[PDB]
């Protein structure tokens, strides 16, 4: 399994590499600079934030996470297991999200997922353990690696917007080929695809 790649601390190297693909050379200049993501010091809490926020507005997602934070002991595995399912529903969580959050806390306290020591685990091993939790598929696991853990080399082949972007920009090309070229910077390439979509949704000119 590939060795864990550290989070980028700056994007210059990444952008130069990606820019070797004339599509991304254009996309990166059109979209400009993207902020450098710092790996979270609290993976568990970021996992819970992600889960809790799914399908909610940005303000609603913040609110509900704040209500979780306000439970006794906060957003910590052992503390969340002492909160009843009725009180987790009570903060506004769907039953699906209650179950996922309970499942993630239980996995942390049982040692099934060592949220304190992910830094050394290959992407796929982190993915496989997250996937075993109810309500968390590969896509959620991959988004967590990319956005929470700031791993640099993640292309989520189940993200519809990424796949629609590759289809649009590279018609008739094998997506595995296209995206492999972006390695070891598939995460920033992914972020530029989403940025380009936002750019187009704002009225921008196409490539």
* 31 Cβ neighbours under 8 A, 6+ residues apart: 192, 195, 196, 199
Q: Which of 5, 7, 17, 102 binds Ni ion (CB under 5 A)?
A: 17
d(CA 156, CA 137): 11
Q: Which of 139, 147, 170, 194 binds Cl ion (CB under 5 A)?
A: 139
For Ni ion, which is the closer residue by CB, 99 or 181?
A: 181
Of 154, 132, 135, 158, which is closest to residue 145 (Cα–Cα)?
154
- Counting residues that bind Cl ion (by CB under 5 A) gives 4
| 99 touches Ni ion by CB under 5 A | no
| 19 touches Cl ion by CB under 5 A | no
For Cl ion, which is the closer residue by CB, 100 or 196?
A: 100
Q: How far is the CB of 118 from Cl ion (least distance, A)?
A: 18
* 84 Cβ neighbours under 8 A, 6+ residues apart: none
Q: How far is the CB of 185 from Ni ion (least distance, A)?
A: 8
* Segment interacting with Ni ion, rule: CB under 5 A, options 15-23, 34-42, 165-173, 188-196: 15-23
The contact pattern for Cl ion, residues 80-109, with x = CB under 5 A and - = no contact, is: --------------x---------------
- Which residue's CB comes closest to Cl ion? 137
* Start-to-end C-alpha separation, the chain: 36
* Segment interacting with Cl ion, rule: CB under 5 A, options 22-30, 74-82, 118-126, 133-141: 133-141
d(CA 43, CA 115): 6
d(CA 120, CA 111): 16
Count, residues in the chain: 207
| 181 touches Ni ion by CB under 5 A | no
Q: Which of 6, 70, 137, 204 binds Cl ion (CB under 5 A)?
A: 137
Any idea what the Cα angle at residue 41 is, between residues 59 and 101, rounded to 5°?
55
For Cl ion, which is the closer residue by CB, 8 or 68?
A: 68
For Cl ion, which is the closer residue by CB, 30 or 56?
A: 56
d(CA 146, CA 188): 9
| 147 touches Cl ion by CB under 5 A | no
Asked whether the beta carbons of 131 and 138 are under 8 A apart, the reply is yes
- Residues near Ni ion (CB under 5 A) are 17
């Amino acid at each position: 399994l590939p060795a864990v790649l550290p989070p980028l601390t700056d994007h210059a190297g990444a952008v130069a590499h990606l820019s070797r693909d004339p599509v991304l050379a254009q996309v990166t200049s059109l979209c400009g600079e993207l902020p450098v993501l710092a790996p979270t010091p609290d993976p568990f809490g970021r996992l819970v934030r992600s889960v809790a926020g799914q399908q909610l507005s940005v303000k609603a997602a913040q609110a509900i996470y704040g209500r979780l934070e306000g439970l006794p002991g906060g957003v910590v595995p052992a503390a969340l297991l002492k909160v009843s399912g009725d009180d987790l529903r009570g903060v506004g969580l769907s039953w699906a999200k209650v179950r996922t959050v309970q499942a993630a806390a239980a996995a942390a306290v049982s040692g099934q997922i060592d949220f304190a020591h992910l830094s050394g685990q290959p992407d796929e091993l982190v993915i496989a353990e997250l996937v075993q939790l109810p309500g968390i598929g590969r896509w959620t696991a991959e988004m967590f690696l990319l956005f929470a853990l700031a791993r640099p080399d993640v292309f989520s082949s189940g993200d519809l917007a990424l796949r629609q972007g590759v289809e649009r920009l590279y018609p008739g090309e094998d997506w595995r080929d296209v995206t492999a070229r972006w390695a070891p910077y598939r995460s920033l390439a992914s972020r530029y695809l989403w940025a380009n979509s936002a750019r187009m949704q704002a009225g921008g000119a196409p490539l």
